[PDB]
């Protein structure tokens, strides 16, 4: 079933962002993206610039799995999202929330 990969990604995302974990990546901020119903490539190309931290590897793996072409970030209609800076926690929480909404909406891919 197609609704298995998305559920596994949601489980991984909620498992890496739980409050028992230390501050994710310890302060290194991440450029936000436009919530445009299919930000898979956007999230991939905006988290591609997090050097290590050893805690968001599987997340990037599954994201690249959902976006195999890894289209360049130049698709954004405004690079201002690549100019505003927010910590990893806020961006990953917003991504998790929007992905939960998309999963509840039946939209898997």
């Amino acid at each position, epitope marked *: 079933p197609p609704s298995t990969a998305l559920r596994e990604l949601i489980e991984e995302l909620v498992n890496i962002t739980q409050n028992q974990k*230390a501050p994710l990546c310890n302060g*290194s901020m991440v450029w936000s993206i436009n919530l445009t119903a299919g930000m898979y490539c956007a999230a991939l190309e905006s*988290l591609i610039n*997090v*050097s*290590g*931290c*050893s805690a968001i590897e599987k997340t990037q793996r599954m994201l*690249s*799995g959902f976006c195999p072409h890894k289209v360049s970030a130049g698709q954004f209609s405004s690079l201002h999202v690549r100019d505003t800076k927010i910590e990893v926690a806020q961006f990953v929480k917003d991504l998790l929330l929007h992905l939960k909404k998309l999963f509840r909406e039946g939209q898997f891919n």
Partner: antibody
Amino acid sequence: SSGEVQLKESGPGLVAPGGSLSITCTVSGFSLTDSSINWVRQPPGKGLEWLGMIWGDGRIDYADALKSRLSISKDSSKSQVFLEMTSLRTDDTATYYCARDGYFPYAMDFWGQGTSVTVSS
Amino acid sequence: DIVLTQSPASLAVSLGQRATISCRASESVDSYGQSYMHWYQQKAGQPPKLLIYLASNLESGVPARFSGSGSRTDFTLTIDPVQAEDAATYYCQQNAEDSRTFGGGTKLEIKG
């Protein structure tokens, strides 16, 4: 101009069999909190063999072969990463590199020169 | 731990030909539609250098001779043509698990 990313290595080349071998790779230009360093090894003439790694968050990995006799640690203040080894046999004679991992998919991009290590008598 | 074998362990090919260095894996290495295989180039007394990441994506500052392919079990490093400065031992390496493991090495040189 000099001043590139310095993958500097520091460690004694000769130790007695059975001692505690220690190597200290020094890296300048950035901090260990935003990068990860690996410990690749290469016996003379033989092939490479991964022997551990350490991330900027605090995770430490070891190869399943030498997971017991090996230990890794880091120090972001000194900007250096340690290495230990127990019961050094003569086969352990090999060059010890220390490479830097780039971004996703976290392959190896930078490479130092490596300090030599020999154990004969 | 996963082990990686190569064929041949050492290779000597003259200029103008097409290189073919295969790296066989004990099991499958792909994960979520992508395979986590790599290559490296080590010269005499020189440190390694990344050549191809994900076994299908070339690195910057790499000649067009380099080529990578494979489907979850095999990975061939294709260099064409064969040049003298390309005579350096290569090492296929995977990071698809918690413990990486380099291949068996493949020394390359020019024959005759």
